[PDB]
């Protein structure tokens, strides 16, 4: 286990949903030979937030994959989740900084790792519900990991979807249509979001090219409030989609458009997505 007294604060790493992550050095010998770790806590402690957080901890403790951030432990009320520290941070920030150094085949290596981590979630009947480059972390220049499970839900034993409407700002521009209309989350809604992740990669996180910017442009910037959701629902229903990013090959854009099927059942599987990505990577090599 981990004691509060030996968790030395280094810096704030970020905030997301109702959580906050910080860089600490776990130094029990107080001789500065201790490991640097990532510490997640609730920005505002509440019992509803607490029970969610305890389920989140149980979800991460149960996952062991090369492309999933490692669970290290817990530190006690004022519950904290201890994870490994991934030195290159979010893929979102990393891609922007190394734009000119990261090519298409490297983007596809990352894509492949995201698919393998996501298929592993599916095998446990876990629904991520928040796939985005800001939630993917970089271990090194050749390895990425799904780095947060704040919205992750376990499917009911008898159902392939899970219904949930949480108070607060939902990442609607990554949501499948049935998530916007019916609050239905499944492996297939994660596949939809995965296409948005693949889109994000090929845009190299250019600000004007982000999914909110592109959708708001298509919807109209005059749209405000709960009306934005309505107009987005209508846009997707009429097969309005994110454009092919600049320089993206037609075959990579084809993967994105296939993930963005209004028909939940026609969306590819994470196993098929991995085969397709690996095949394209092999051809490029
Ligand atoms: C990008 C920042 N961020 C967040 C983070 O705020 N998230 C928000 C929900 C709260 C989720 C995980 C994405 C979590 C981590 C993290 C890191 N290493 C291991 N973990 C779990 C790390 N390393 C950053 C290297 C540079 O350090 C100076 N940056 C992180």
Curated annotation (Swiss-Prot):
Ubiquitously expressed throughout most tissues. One of its GO terms (biological process) is regulation of inflammatory response. It is found in: Endomembrane system; Cytoplasm; Nucleus. ATP binds at residues 13-21, 40. Its main location: membrane. One of its GO terms (molecular function) is identical protein binding. Autophosphorylated, leading to regulate its activity. Autophosphorylation on Tyr-26, Tyr-120 and Tyr-126 in response to growth hormone (GH) are required for maximal kinase activity. Also phosphorylated by TEC. Phosphorylated on tyrosine residues in response to interferon gamma signaling. Phosphorylated on tyrosine residues in response to a signaling cascade that is activated by increased cellular retinol. Belongs to the protein kinase superfamily. Tyr protein kinase family. JAK subfamily. Interacts with EPOR, LYN, SIRPA, SH2B1 and TEC. Interacts with IL23R. Interacts with SKB1. Interacts with STAM2. Interacts with IFNGR2 (via intracellular domain). Interacts with LEPR (Isoform B). Interacts with HSP90AB1; promotes functional activation in a heat shock-dependent manner. Interacts with STRA6. Interacts with RHEX; this interaction occurs in a erythropoietin (EPO)-dependent manner. Interacts with ASB2; the interaction targets JAK2 for Notch-induced proteasomal degradation. Interacts with MPL/TPOR. Possesses 2 protein kinase domains. The second one probably contains the catalytic domain, while the presence of slight differences suggest a different role for protein kinase 1. It is linked to Chromosomal aberrations involving JAK2 are found in both chronic and acute forms of eosinophilic, lymphoblastic and myeloid leukemia. Translocation t(8;9)(p22;p24) with PCM1 links the protein kinase domain of JAK2 to the major portion of PCM1. Translocation t(9;12)(p24;p13) with ETV6. Budd-Chiari syndrome: A syndrome caused by obstruction of hepatic venous outflow involving either the hepatic veins or the terminal segment of the inferior vena cava. Obstructions are generally caused by thrombosis and lead to hepatic congestion and ischemic necrosis. Clinical manifestations observed in the majority of patients include hepatomegaly, right upper quadrant pain and abdominal ascites. This is Tyrosine-protein kinase JAK2. It comes from Homo sapiens. The lineage of its organism: Eukaryota, Metazoa, Chordata, Craniata, Vertebrata. The gene is JAK2.
